[PDB]
Nucleic acid binder design. Structure first.
Ligand code: K
Ligand code: MG
Ligand code: MG
Ligand code: MG
Ligand code: MG
Ligand code: MG
Ligand code: MG
Ligand code: MG
Ligand code: MG
Ligand code: MG
Ligand code: MG
Ligand code: MG
Ligand code: MG
Ligand code: MG
Ligand code: MG
Lengths: 197, 172, 136, 191
RNA sequence: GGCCAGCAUCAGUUUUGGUGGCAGGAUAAAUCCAUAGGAAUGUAGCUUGCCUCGGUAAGUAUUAUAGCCUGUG
RNA sequence: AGAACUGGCGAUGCGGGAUGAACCGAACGUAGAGUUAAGGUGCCGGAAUACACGCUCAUCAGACACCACAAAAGGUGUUAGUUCAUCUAGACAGCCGGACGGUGGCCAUGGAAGUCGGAAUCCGCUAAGGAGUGUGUAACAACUCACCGGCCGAAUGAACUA
RNA sequence: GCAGUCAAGCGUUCAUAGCGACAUUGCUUUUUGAUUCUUCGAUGUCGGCUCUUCCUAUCAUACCGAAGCAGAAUUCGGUAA
RNA sequence: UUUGCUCCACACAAUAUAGAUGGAUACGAAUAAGGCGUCCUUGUGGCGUCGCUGAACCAUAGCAGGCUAGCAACGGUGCACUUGGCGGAAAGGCCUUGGGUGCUUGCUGGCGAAUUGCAAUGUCAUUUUGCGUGGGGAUAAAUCAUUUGUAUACGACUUAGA
């Protein structure tokens, strides 16, 4: 319902999130996924590491530069899931994929924009409590991603700035709420309440 | 087979010149409809007595409704089922408000825990356990304690929309 | 010097707990847990709202913060009497939850002329509120 | 079976305060402050009377209720460690070569240094975990004592010292040399 | 006259709602009402025991200052 | 590799089984609309991230017939059952106290002392105590267990089934 | 060809340290068969040399568990290509 | 450069559009827990309250939004100026000062709309390019050929040459 939907990928069950996002792109919705390093996969970290190593051993025998490319970054792992669920060899699939951006952290274009979640892909809502799960950043680092520390540092900086922004917004919201609480017994407010507002 | 009803089925073993008024055998059959109910009646009657549908007749078939469908009962259920390698009798206990609901639960549970399909299960008996402390299964006894209360932690709300703007909560 | 443990109070599946039916023939009516069948099933009764006495899956209802004293297994007439004595309907209607349900039904019932009047009144209230916010 | 409710009791003595936010337990007693994160277990704590905490699992399976008692034991060990402390006594055992155990510093890091183990020229170094105090017992021959609030830290430090002295390429039933935990109790006597 | 449509009233096929009147069954079973009899996950009352408000424990007690179950109508 | 009956493929497209002569469904003029078959409905992919009761966590999980494999034997993994028992007249576990007199019994063993040991598992006191249950010692001295008590408070043990 | 299960026995005493009869369950396609589906308008028929890669049912090297492991030597086994 | 190049403003011509049609509306963390408000003894604190979805919030009336006359209040909003600060992860945006101008539907009037004929997207967005009119700005290189041999099959490489 927005020109661009920014999904905060934190705790989002990579496969289910990828399914939602693939359908969204094919339906023509622009999607930006942020914080791909905080995505989750069901199963123990060792399980998912073994799965990625099974992926890693697959390569074109006569030329490894032809074989399947094993992207290590969490955004590219999520992108691999999405591409496997998009018909990426057609022009339609290509257009759908250009309707998508995936990032580690929340870079400057989107750190000041609203992030949404996908409840049908949320780990806390989908996974049975006590089921073990993996974090994409940890898995990616274990398989050779180099920027977990840089992403974490920039995320801490962004969180400091965003907490300051939210403190200001909370103060202003309290002011607006007080001003609406006053003049809530006015005739206009009573008529609005009668009409449901 | 489906959401069950209970039927009384009374069959006759059709009269002859020598034996008019045969012995009128009755069964309580759990089945989704009267066709299955009569089929099941003939199945069990052929297991018990020298009769078949061709040599007998269905004298009556009547749905038996639960006497008190809105009171919670503990049921002892004796079943005989075929496993992959033999036949076994088991006794289970089900808490429910009607015999048909208890039998539906029993069939679900047999299929879930022993992979026993409908065809492999005979309901030997379903009986209300009138006196608690005659309930001998812990998974039913734990619901018969005084002032039973329990929370429902980790509530998961089903969203009507693809995207949420709230990062939901599982409080309850 | 005193031990502090966060309470984390849940709504309890218990006899006398008031629940809101979210789907089914009732779909928005209040009922009372008459007793508990399983971990997922309860016998409820909603005689004041017209909810028939029935076994229902706990996933078909949402527990409300309202409880009233009710003996386990109470029949429909007893549930009606205790419900009236505890004034469950008034307590529920006083809550922000029921007020939100009523507000959304009212908004759904607004006609086009009423929506236009809502816009005009909102503009008036907004003029007043923005002036107050600038003043303070 | 999915038991409806299982609960365990954690007794709090007089001089101990237990602060439990969501699942981070802080225990404060005469000896110090211990902290434990239990966000991996899905239990519910509830204070009863300032001398009793209850820990409960609702609608829990066999493994869940198995972990409930583990939670109770861990909190009990926290309380026991801030009240009575924990002390592990290890004995050196050797047939011929005396084991030389001392406390050395490397950039102020408090290693337990082990020399001459089975004649080895290799010098073994076991770091001392923070909160663990090392005292060599006079009036007992070849006894090292590790003391501290957290039984986890003192027992793992003792276990590290025991593991550093494993015999290789020999029949261990014969070459019994090593540093072995001989006693595990509390710092405070007769309590 | 040619091209493309819009609406209305019909006809053929079909799809999807709203609503009315009947029939059957244990002339549904229930609920409800009345009545008879019970025990308990035992309500009031009563006795013994504690003591931090004043509540709680163990008995007895079958409706009382809650109720429930079964049969019958 | 060779027969029987039928149905097929060959001679046959179509929907399904990813793919495939034979399987499932269904057989075919050119179109429109409706409904279905078999098969499916997270995404690829049209179609419920439907509803419901359970089961399963796999450091090789599993995921629909033909069909693209896995067995005997095992596992206090976990689930549900069968049968036999113990148990508020206190069940199992743990802790604590004892665990005898005759008698270190007799026989002997090089040395045996309730116990390397050989026959009987003797009587009494018994809550219990076995000529002992084991260990230890050349033997001892001595312990220790069965056993009995105290505490504890409601469940427990065994053999099986899938 | 390789690997299991049972365990009568061997192993001074002790079934299972290491073995293991009588039986019995399998796996593999580095044996040889069996078959005749492809190729007879032709897929160059032994071996070696050369060179790359893969498998693990591991000979060595790494780290380990077991022993009828005192040491040394050795044997059985695990992760391991 | 037979007046070349670049930037800005305007106008006119083309050019297409993976697809605008009120607003992508910014804490972080947890979920067997949190958000907000408030208080203090400032904490893993007390008290209150909320959720049970955005079904929200904001915006939203006026020839696709005209021309005018007042009231009330010093608000809201657009524009071009302007003060200062913050923002490097892809910052290219966020905030803030002051005055100026326009609008204001917060309220009350006056005028206009028709014939697009009973609908026809009934044209309102932004992407690149070109040209012309003004203003502003700057005044090179690379390759071939020759040359080197740290290079080299040829290309390529690496050197030198007003
Ligand atoms: K040939
Ligand atoms: Mg690399
Ligand atoms: Mg050696
Ligand atoms: Mg018609
Ligand atoms: Mg032919
Ligand atoms: Mg055919
Ligand atoms: Mg297939
Ligand atoms: Mg047709
Ligand atoms: Mg689809
Ligand atoms: Mg098996
Ligand atoms: Mg042939
Ligand atoms: Mg040829
Ligand atoms: Mg050739
Ligand atoms: Mg060739
Ligand atoms: Mg191997």
């Amino acid at each position: 319902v927005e020109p661009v939907v920014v999904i905060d990928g934190k705790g989002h069950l990579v496969g289910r999130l990828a399914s939602v996002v693939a359908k969204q792109l094919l339906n023509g919705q622009k999607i930006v996924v942020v914080r791909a390093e905080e995505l989750n996969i069901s199963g123990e970290f060792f399980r998912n590491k073994l799965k990625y190593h099974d992926f890693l051993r697959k390569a074109t025998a006569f030329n490894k530069t032809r074989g399947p490319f094993h992207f290590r970054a969490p955004s590219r792992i999520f992108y691999k899931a999405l591409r496997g669920m998009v018909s990426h060899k057609t022009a339609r699939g290509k257009a759908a994929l250009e309707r998508l951006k995936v990032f580690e952290g929340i870079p400057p274009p989107y750190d000041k924009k609203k992030r949404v979640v996908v409840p049908q892909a949320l780990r806390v809502l989908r996974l049975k409590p006590g089921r073990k799960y993996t974090t994409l950043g940890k898995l990616s680092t274990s398989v050779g991603w180099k920027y977990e520390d840089v992403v974490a540092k920039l995320e801490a900086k962004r969180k400091v700035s965003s907490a300051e922004y939210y403190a200001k917004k909370r103060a202003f919201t309290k002011k607006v709420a007080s001003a609406n609480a006053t003049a809530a017994e006015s005739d206009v407010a009573k008529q609005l309440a009668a009409l449901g507002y | 087979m489906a959401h069950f009803k209970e039927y009384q089925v009374i069959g006759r073993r059709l009269p002859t010149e020598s034996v008019p008024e045969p012995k009128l055998f009755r069964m309580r059959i759990f089945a989704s409809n009267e066709v299955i109910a009569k089929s099941r009646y003939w199945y069990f009657l052929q297991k018990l007595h020298k009769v078949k549908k061709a040599s007998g007749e269905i004298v009556s078939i009547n749905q038996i409704n639960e006497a008190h469908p809105t009171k919670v009962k503990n049921f002892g259920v004796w079943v005989r089922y075929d496993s992959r390698s033999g036949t076994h009798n088991m006794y289970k206990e089900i808490r429910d408000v009607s015999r048909v609901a208890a039998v539906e639960t029993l069939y679900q549970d047999m299929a879930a825990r022993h992979r026993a399909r409908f065809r492999s299960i005979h309901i030997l008996k379903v009986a209300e356990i009138e006196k608690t402390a005659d309930v001998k299964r812990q998974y039913v006894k734990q619901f018969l304690t005084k002032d039973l209360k329990f929370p429902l932690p980790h509530r998961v709300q089903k969203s009507t929309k693809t995207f949420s703007y709230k990062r939901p909560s599982t409080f309850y | 010097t005193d031990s502090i443990v966060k309470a984390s109070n849940w709504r309890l599946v218990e006899v006398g707990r008031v629940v809101l039916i979210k789907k089914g023939q009732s779909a928005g009516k209040l009922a009372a847990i008459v007793e508990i069948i399983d971990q997922k099933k309860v016998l409820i009764d909603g005689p004041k709202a017209g909810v028939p006495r029935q076994a229902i899956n706990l996933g078909q209802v949402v527990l409300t913060p309202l409880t009233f004293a009710l003996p386990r297994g109470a029949r429909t007439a007893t549930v009606s009497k205790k419900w009236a004595a505890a004034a469950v309907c008034e307590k529920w209607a006083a809550s922000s939850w029921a007020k939100k349900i009523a507000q959304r039904e009212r908004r759904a019932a607004l006609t086009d002329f009423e929506r236009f009047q809502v816009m005009v009144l909102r503009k008036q209230k907004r003029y007043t509120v923005k002036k107050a916010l600038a003043k303070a | 079976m999915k038991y409806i409710q299982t609960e365990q009791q954690i007794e709090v003595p007089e001089g101990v305060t237990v602060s439990i936010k969501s699942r981070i337990v802080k225990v404060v007693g005469p000896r110090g402050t211990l902290t434990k994160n239990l966000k991996h277990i899905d239990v519910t704590f509830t204070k009863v009377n300032n001398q009793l905490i209850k820990v409960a699992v609702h609608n829990g399976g066999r493994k869940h209720v198995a972990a409930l008692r583990t939670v109770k034991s861990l909190v009990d060990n926290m309380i026991t460690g801030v009240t009575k402390g924990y002390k592990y006594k290890m004995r050196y055992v050797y047939a011929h070569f005396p084991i030389n155990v001392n406390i050395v510093e490397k950039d102020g890091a408090k290693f337990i240094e082990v020399r001459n183990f089975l004649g080895d020229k290799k010098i073994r170094n076991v770091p001392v975990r923070d909160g663990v105090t090392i005292e060599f017992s006079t009036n007992v021959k070849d006894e090292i004592v590790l003391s501290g609030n957290s039984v986890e830290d003192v027992s793992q430090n003792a276990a590290d010292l025991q593991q550093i002295c494993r015999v290789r390429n020999k029949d261990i039933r014969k070459f019994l040399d090593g540093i072995y935990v001989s006693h595990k109790g509390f710092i405070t006597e007769d309590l």
